[PDB]
Structure 1
């Protein structure tokens, strides 16, 4: 004598409710909502759980998203302040962090994040024993290490956003300059995400044709080098203009989630453990071209760098290991 009872019947047999391609997003900031609507519009997960400390914002973010249910293909969207809401995720994207202050040292900024992360990550793993973690949070190479360390996960289930977006930018900028789509242009920015990102000049090509062999070359002087500077700059440009970044980043991450979720074995410049790779001896994460599948990092693509390059590589590893003087102040 309920509408529901009058209109929906039952087979004699049934099985407890279920989610198998669950994904969780931590942080409902600009990066987090951006990451979350790109996964949803991509139909990568049969469940998306949203987790932040900001009650109100979380709930409202959650609702905005549910109201659009009709337009999507993800059955269940949820949000929680509590981590148990994330219980049973395939993949976790972390986008929560502090942003670096007036007179803040990279050491002190990294410490602040360690103390937030101590509360996030341990709870993630306990609710999600079989998850893979994807760290977007900047500084990414150090926050990746931290996440690694705080969780207790096999190193292959710990991935850093790293240098994917930067490469996506480089490829864009080649493309504009060359007149071909960004996806026909191929170049790789690897190493330590940011100012200290190495641009593999010698891997740049179109159709299989090496720019380097054609332009007479190029690395040292006659405007092309520029292409790397506003890859890193044009990024501050954005902020100076809009007051934050979200869109390209979110998309970048759905790109990663599709590979992983669809078990593709697609090659991405992501932040990995590069220990005893290119003469690096300690526990440092930086970008290298990795194959990804559903269990995280399946393999590494061994570039053949110049010394010039691997030298630079090593200077990041040192500089990062140095910071790794963490656990308090």
Structure 2
């Protein structure tokens, strides 16, 4: 005597609801909403859970997203201040962090993030024993190590956004200069995400043709090196212009989630544990070309860098290991 009861009948047999390709996003900031809508628009998950501390903003983000249900293919959208809402995720994207202040030292900024992460990550793993974590938060190589350390996850189930987007940007700029689509141009920015990112000049190519053998070469002087500078610059340009970053990054992450979710074994420059790789001796995460599958990092692509290069790589590992003087102030 209910509309529902008059209209929907039942088979004698049935099974408790279910979600198998669940993904959870932490933070409903600009990066978070951008990551969440590109995952959605991509049909990577049969469930998406959004987790933030800001009640209002969360519910409202949740709602906006739910109202568009008819236009999507993700069955269940949810949000929670509580972590049990993320219970059963395949993948977790973390985009929650502090943004670095007036007179803040990289040590104090990472320390700040350590005390936020203490509440985030422990709860994720308890509700999602089988998840893989994807750290977006900056500084990414340090926050990845923290997430690793805070969770207790095999090192392969802990990935950092690392140098993916940067490479995505490098390939873009090449393409504009060369006249071919960014997906036909191939070059790699690896190392420590940021100003200290190494551009593998000698891997640069189109079709399989090494730019280096043709330009007579290039690494040292005759305007090409430029290409690396506004990869890291043009990123500050954006901020200065818009007041933040979201679209490119979100897109970047969906790219990573598709590979992971669809067990592709595609090669990505993401932040990994690079201990005793290129003479690095301690527990430092940096970007390397990794194959990804559904259990996270499946393998590492062993580049053949020059010393010039690996030296630089080493300088990052030291510098980062130094910050790793964490657990308070």
User: TM over 0.5: same fold?
Assistant: yes
Deviation at 1:78, TM superposition (A): 0.1
Query: In structure 2, what is the Cα distance between the partners aligned to 1:130 and 1:185?
Result: 36
The offset of 1:201, in angstroms, is 0.1
**Structure 2 gap ranges (5+):** none
- Distance, in Å, in 2 between the alignment partners of 1:64 and 1:152 is 35
Q: What is residue 100 of structure 1 aligned with on the other side? A: 100
Per-residue Cα deviation, 1:246-289 (whole angstroms, up to 9, x for no partner): 00000000000000000000000000000000000000000000
> How far did 1:30 drift?
0.1
1:270-317 deviation digits (Å, cap 9, x = unpaired)? 000000000000000000000000000000000000000000000000
Displacement after TM superposition at 1:6 (Å): 0.1
Unaligned runs of 5+ in 1: none
C-alpha RMSD of the superposition: 0.1
TM-score by length of 1: 1.00
Cα offsets for 1:211-262 (capped at 9, x unmatched): 0000000000000000000000000000000000000000000000000000
Q: Distance in 2 between matches of 1:279 and 1:232?
A: 26
1:130-183 deviation line (CA, Å, top 9, x unaligned): 000000000000000000000000000000000000000000000000000000
Determine the C-alpha separation between the residues in 2 that align with 1:229 and 1:205: 19
> Per-residue CA shift, 1:38-72, capped at 9, x if unaligned?
00000000000000000000000000000000000
Using the TM superposition, give the Cα deviation of residue 93 of structure 1 relative to its aligned residue in structure 2, in angstroms.
0.0
Give the distance between the partners of 1:66 and 1:245, measured in 2 at CA.
Answer: 24
Determine the C-alpha separation between the residues in 2 that align with 1:178 and 1:207.
12
> What TM-score does the superposition give when structure 2 sets the normalisation length?
1.00
Moved over 3 A (4+): none
Partner of 2:259: 259
Shift of 1:79: 0.1
Paired residues in the alignment total 329
| C-alpha distance in structure 2 between counterparts of 1:80 and 1:246, whole Å | 22
- In structure 2, how many angstroms separate the alpha carbons of the residues matched to 1:270 and 1:234? 20
